[PDB]
Amino acid sequence: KAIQVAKQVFNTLTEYIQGPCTGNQQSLAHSRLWDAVVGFLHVFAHMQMKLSQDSSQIELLKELMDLQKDMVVMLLSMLEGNVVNGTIGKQMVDMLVESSNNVEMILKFFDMLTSSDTFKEYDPDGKGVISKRDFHKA
């Protein structure tokens, strides 16, 4: 119920910007938005690794990654009319530097596609139901 709310809030924040209104980019630049993004990345990095273990709960993970998608869409929309030595890029870099160790867990998690490549060399007939132990072998 909170994921839906934050998703809609991010979509509104895109629609103020997606047609590149420079006032509605500069105003978000000089605001608390980056201090929200750091906490959001911090929850994402731990929660997607923690929740991924259990097969009981995957819909919540889909909701969370949809929220993360809309967040990065907003961040891209901030950079439409992006001059080279710009301010918005500098603030985004300061944000990412401030939350580097959170980001690195996400990028390490996205190294995954790279999960069925290690599947066919022990398959009996290329089916999809191979052993729990042959997987560790692979």
Residue spans of alpha helices (H) in the chain? 2-15, 23-29, 33-51, 59-77, 87-98, 100-109, 132-137
Q: Is the Cβ–Cβ distance between 20 and 80 less than 8 Å?
A: yes
**Contact by Cβ (8 Å): 67, 10:** yes
> Alpha-carbon torsion 107, 108, 109, 112, what sign?
positive
Among 115, 90, 108, 113, smallest CA distance to 44 is for 108
Separation of first and last alpha carbons in the chain: 40
d(CA 45, CA 126): 34
Are the beta carbons of 34 and 65 closer than 8 angstroms?
no
Q: Assess contact for 109 and 94: CB atoms under 8 A.
A: no
Q: List C-alpha distances in Å: 91 to 2, 94, 96, 130.
A: 27, 5, 9, 48
